[PDB]
């Protein structure tokens, strides 16, 4: 009867979102806690880390991941500079039918840190293939995107015209993104760029009949030293 | 130890009597069950040093031959403050091996 | 009503509209209305909303 | 042997058939003459170049401390019955029989008394006077005390008894100096505060203001509003009916004062009510930031009462202090951490753009440069927190905090609450250092290394000393320094400087572990202190 | 005497009074404090009220010495507010009526 | 076996400032915390207390919060086991780390002595 | 069944060995009160937090210590049932 | 030995600077 008494007084997910100051934080299962109020308040504190997603999944963790084939682990490039890949291949192949200064320099002289996630980055099944999104930034580009466009990749990409910069200057930039500035369209042509119609031109500056730009500015019209640094 | 979870420690107040290990078991930490970096000495409960047990291998139960130490880890996380680590259960392993012995030869 | 994570597990229309009232009021408070709250200096030595001050400013006189 | 040149520098050296080792400092561009006296149970040396430097191996350590007195032509030791131990000193057309005080206590001092617990004080930059706000919970302001005293005397007379025997005026004359007989003071919610303009050279209080009874003063700033001229103004936050342990107020006010008479007289302008206790104030681009309660306002000075030019209400808990570099603003709240904040001016907004990932009850903060802030903590730590390199200064959630967080690059458990951190240089031309003082009375400094060689060296000194000379009480030094958050990027100077007092055989153990000799190692210790500090 | 965190009464009639904040003190005992007109309270005398008494400046002790102390240090600011080029410390410290503003320098008095 | 490695590594790097990478390794280690085979569950718990001494308890506490009061009971078991293993060590350091918890009508849950402002 | 009651015995004994640990049915009240009581013992410990409160209020460290130890009895109001 | 020489030079730098400052003094 006591279990039923708590059930009878148990809150709906709508009520729990209502009284609670933050409602998103509130999951469908939080309504099943002993104290809905303390649990939502504890999930609504800064810097906390949410419980891993697979607690309820009937199947196992990485057992569910299973079936596809995976390429063997790829060595850190600075270990790869030693070539111990080649030495191991040669000895292994002879059987199948290295100097020391390079190794010490590889560990100390030229070893550098990797890219590491900050506190709150939980691992989950698919995070290695999760598509990085949200990047609403027009300025960021790729090399696969540039090449598969036929647009230059690397340091010349800025003078390599994105084929929709001419449509930015023609209909305005993408209308969902007024905040989009396009170099050579709403900011000046990048350094050493040239507006033009030849292969590699920046079009013509978006212009009104008095001589002001209709989009951005097509021509481009403290003491940050750290405190205690080594020498 | 970390290897047979069926084992128990005395867990009373430590004392001043040092702990000793058999020649058989010697060379290891009692808890982290490694074999390295001995830092600090073991101390044992008054009962667990009373009686014939003056100088016995804490683990193997046998003759005291050397001192018993604590690994650097266990002393860094302060697992060395739980009193007598004297194991007050003999454990199935010694019994069963002796029994199969008496059977065979 | 914008479909946002705040409405996760809301299935009833009445709950969605209500939740909306509280959420609208809260974002109302956290957002700062500059003109509605700014305090401007009456030249005699008084304080009135910047919106009223600019309105009256032009408003033949201010 | 001790060597004095005539360009003010001086050398020490130990004596052998040859001069073996050396170390040298400066002592003034005028020729350096050396003299002998015996002091406090030890012989020690004088030396004058442009002031007098007493050098003594302070229980086996050279301390070379200047004195507080005028320049000299000659002197020598002296003893008497009148002056049992001291100095004959002939000086600028003068002869002096002197005596030297406590031969410890690196610092001098001179004391000027106050009335209340002085919570804060700022320096008026033209005249160089101090504005101090003093406060006391559980006390009586002078008015109410005199009134209540005489009033109690009034209910004395009503005893209706021989009326004749009148202790009334006797009492009312009697005032025991509170400084020595205790503070005749009590009440639970009753504050009392005071403002004082005080000259720093001589102790005289140039001016004084006594707030009402239940008013407490919590923060003060000295600014110059852009719209008005060059007049300096003093703003004094004030809470009204604070109750401490439950917590509730009537509310705040912000007294404003004109700072007239070249910097020697406060005179009232106006007090603007405000809806919580404004706990910290700062000048900022011609207008004054004021953190009140949990909100952060930009205010500007009107001639009726302060006006509100902008605001932010996201700040988490309650605002304890606020710092501002030229462009952006480090709010520092009581529980959550430092919170960075950017002031978009033309568009007139304050935008939260990045903040710390830890909880940390900040008491005081200080800005090392654009990127980094060094903050004390109330439990005893010191942290140093810098924004990572690539951040976007200007935006318009993540882990319930702001979008991008700030990494922590030094943690260290000083040992006592640190109430005031500040970056400066002590000796002239000696390199910038970070001076902290604490709530027990200690004054320490933190000092950045410059060269990986030395940093690794000191690291190995302390690592070996740690295990070969453990603390007395059995604490484990690494743990102690890592009480709350684990130590990171700091070398302990008071472990290392204990080498000199270990026992020589162990001195040798270590000294060989680095393959140096005790003198070599000791000198290399004495550098950092010699060159950064006293 | 200002509130103490520990008194310790030596031999030789000293009495070291370590005020919890501010300066310390070392007194000596020049009267063992009996046989005068100060009324002595007791366990035995009845009332139903509490006996009163009246404070007075020192009689039975004398202040031999006084150790300087800084604690607490409520604010500190390192600055150059006199001519000289070594910056002084302005350390505003104390509690209650015994509070003070101290100026410190490197040197010996 | 990977969890054993992290244990020993963090115990060796104690106090040298290599915390960012230990923090990242802790992020991968954490999700195994729901597991059954005694050898792996016990290797994981060992790793977690090593990481406690090397990261601090403020971190482990932030990781351990949201599930102290979860509606499940398998998780609440696991989380209270971890949170004890912390609290036994470093139960003093945990003082300046607990979150601030709002008081309800008939109790008082906030410690005000900690924000006596000076 | 077996799991619940052996872990229940282990948690009750570990708790009666260490005041303040928890178990899967610890309630908000016991959590919060153990957490206060530890804060109190630690203020009286660290010689310094004592100075901080004894200056924030205007009491003397003996009176402060006394009030802390008075409160350690029932710090978060009376129990909940 | 190079490190010894180096710190010798460091000290020479210090003394030179402080004494030249005294020289302006
Ligand atoms: Zn071990
Ligand atoms: Zn025992
Ligand atoms: Zn054995």
mmCIF file of C-alpha atoms in Angstrom, chain B:
data_model
loop_
_atom_site.group_PDB
_atom_site.id
_atom_site.type_symbol
_atom_site.label_atom_id
_atom_site.label_comp_id
_atom_site.label_asym_id
_atom_site.label_seq_id
_atom_site.Cartn_x
_atom_site.Cartn_y
_atom_site.Cartn_z
ATOM 1 C CA UNK B 1 44.378 -10.219 -0.624
ATOM 2 C CA UNK B 2 43.230 -8.842 -4.000
ATOM 3 C CA UNK B 3 43.286 -12.388 -5.422
ATOM 4 C CA UNK B 4 40.937 -14.501 -3.247
ATOM 5 C CA UNK B 5 37.976 -12.288 -2.262
ATOM 6 C CA UNK B 6 37.014 -14.850 0.403
ATOM 7 C CA UNK B 7 39.799 -13.633 2.698
ATOM 8 C CA UNK B 8 39.402 -11.503 5.814
ATOM 9 C CA UNK B 9 41.630 -9.238 7.877
ATOM 10 C CA UNK B 10 41.776 -8.725 11.648
ATOM 11 C CA UNK B 11 40.884 -5.014 11.372
ATOM 12 C CA UNK B 12 41.378 -4.132 15.025
ATOM 13 C CA UNK B 13 43.629 -1.405 16.333
ATOM 14 C CA UNK B 14 47.219 -1.562 15.192
ATOM 15 C CA UNK B 15 49.881 -1.832 17.837
ATOM 16 C CA UNK B 16 53.652 -1.756 18.072
ATOM 17 C CA UNK B 17 54.584 -5.301 17.099
ATOM 18 C CA UNK B 18 56.006 -5.506 13.595
ATOM 19 C CA UNK B 19 54.746 -8.067 11.133
ATOM 20 C CA UNK B 20 56.747 -10.823 9.515
ATOM 21 C CA UNK B 21 56.373 -13.043 6.470
ATOM 22 C CA UNK B 22 57.416 -16.548 5.612
ATOM 23 C CA UNK B 23 60.334 -17.136 3.330
ATOM 24 C CA UNK B 24 57.748 -18.581 0.972
ATOM 25 C CA UNK B 25 55.584 -15.474 0.738
ATOM 26 C CA UNK B 26 58.339 -12.930 1.325
ATOM 27 C CA UNK B 27 59.087 -10.009 -0.965
ATOM 28 C CA UNK B 28 55.584 -8.620 -1.505
ATOM 29 C CA UNK B 29 53.133 -6.071 -0.178
ATOM 30 C CA UNK B 30 50.319 -7.512 1.841
ATOM 31 C CA UNK B 31 47.425 -5.707 0.185
ATOM 32 C CA UNK B 32 48.313 -4.290 -3.202
ATOM 33 C CA UNK B 33 49.834 -7.745 -3.629
ATOM 34 C CA UNK B 34 52.655 -6.408 -5.768
ATOM 35 C CA UNK B 35 56.333 -7.013 -5.343
ATOM 36 C CA UNK B 36 57.944 -3.594 -5.411
ATOM 37 C CA UNK B 37 58.966 -0.373 -3.684
ATOM 38 C CA UNK B 38 58.522 -1.264 -0.002
ATOM 39 C CA UNK B 39 58.086 2.005 1.877
ATOM 40 C CA UNK B 40 56.762 1.477 5.393
ATOM 41 C CA UNK B 41 56.493 -1.287 7.933
ATOM 42 C CA UNK B 42 53.460 -3.302 8.955
ATOM 43 C CA UNK B 43 52.075 -3.270 12.501
ATOM 44 C CA UNK B 44 49.699 -5.868 13.911
ATOM 45 C CA UNK B 45 46.900 -6.172 16.448
ATOM 46 C CA UNK B 46 47.747 -7.217 19.970
ATOM 47 C CA UNK B 47 45.814 -10.444 19.737
ATOM 48 C CA UNK B 48 47.187 -11.230 16.310
ATOM 49 C CA UNK B 49 50.643 -11.175 17.897
ATOM 50 C CA UNK B 50 49.731 -12.970 21.113
ATOM 51 C CA UNK B 51 50.569 -16.577 21.864
ATOM 52 C CA UNK B 52 52.553 -18.962 19.708
ATOM 53 C CA UNK B 53 51.969 -16.525 16.856
ATOM 54 C CA UNK B 54 54.994 -14.471 17.880
ATOM 55 C CA UNK B 55 56.767 -14.131 14.531
ATOM 56 C CA UNK B 56 54.436 -15.790 12.039
ATOM 57 C CA UNK B 57 53.924 -15.181 8.345
ATOM 58 C CA UNK B 58 50.825 -13.020 8.264
ATOM 59 C CA UNK B 59 49.727 -14.694 5.069
ATOM 60 C CA UNK B 60 51.170 -18.174 4.909
ATOM 61 C CA UNK B 61 50.934 -18.693 8.656
ATOM 62 C CA UNK B 62 54.432 -20.059 8.819
ATOM 63 C CA UNK B 63 57.739 -19.032 10.270
ATOM 64 C CA UNK B 64 58.800 -15.423 10.488
ATOM 65 C CA UNK B 65 61.885 -14.810 8.399
ATOM 66 C CA UNK B 66 61.790 -11.106 7.491
ATOM 67 C CA UNK B 67 59.793 -7.928 7.887
ATOM 68 C CA UNK B 68 56.556 -7.066 6.125
ATOM 69 C CA UNK B 69 56.255 -3.844 4.193
ATOM 70 C CA UNK B 70 53.834 -1.594 2.380
ATOM 71 C CA UNK B 71 53.998 -0.652 -1.255
ATOM 72 C CA UNK B 72 54.325 2.955 -2.266
ATOM 73 C CA UNK B 73 50.798 2.983 -3.591
ATOM 74 C CA UNK B 74 49.072 1.568 -0.566
ATOM 75 C CA UNK B 75 50.952 4.060 1.543
ATOM 76 C CA UNK B 76 50.072 6.908 -0.812
ATOM 77 C CA UNK B 77 46.379 6.220 -0.665
ATOM 78 C CA UNK B 78 46.736 5.435 3.020
ATOM 79 C CA UNK B 79 45.411 1.966 2.886
ATOM 80 C CA UNK B 80 48.026 1.414 5.554
ATOM 81 C CA UNK B 81 45.828 2.724 8.348
ATOM 82 C CA UNK B 82 43.347 -0.091 8.792
ATOM 83 C CA UNK B 83 44.961 -1.875 11.694
ATOM 84 C CA UNK B 84 46.017 -5.479 11.744
ATOM 85 C CA UNK B 85 45.949 -6.912 8.272
ATOM 86 C CA UNK B 86 46.270 -10.292 9.938
ATOM 87 C CA UNK B 87 44.161 -12.731 7.967
ATOM 88 C CA UNK B 88 41.903 -14.538 10.417
ATOM 89 C CA UNK B 89 40.598 -17.089 7.936
ATOM 90 C CA UNK B 90 42.856 -19.823 6.630
ATOM 91 C CA UNK B 91 41.108 -20.027 3.263
ATOM 92 C CA UNK B 92 40.008 -22.893 1.074
ATOM 93 C CA UNK B 93 43.221 -23.087 -0.919
ATOM 94 C CA UNK B 94 45.593 -24.438 1.709
ATOM 95 C CA UNK B 95 42.980 -26.902 2.960
ATOM 96 C CA UNK B 96 42.130 -28.301 -0.451
ATOM 97 C CA UNK B 97 45.695 -28.604 -1.662
ATOM 98 C CA UNK B 98 46.683 -30.432 1.527
ATOM 99 C CA UNK B 99 43.692 -32.725 1.224
ATOM 100 C CA UNK B 100 44.448 -33.659 -2.370
ATOM 101 C CA UNK B 101 48.021 -34.230 -1.244
ATOM 102 C CA UNK B 102 47.028 -36.653 1.496
ATOM 103 C CA UNK B 103 44.890 -38.418 -1.082
ATOM 104 C CA UNK B 104 47.578 -38.740 -3.769
ATOM 105 C CA UNK B 105 50.758 -39.336 -1.779
#
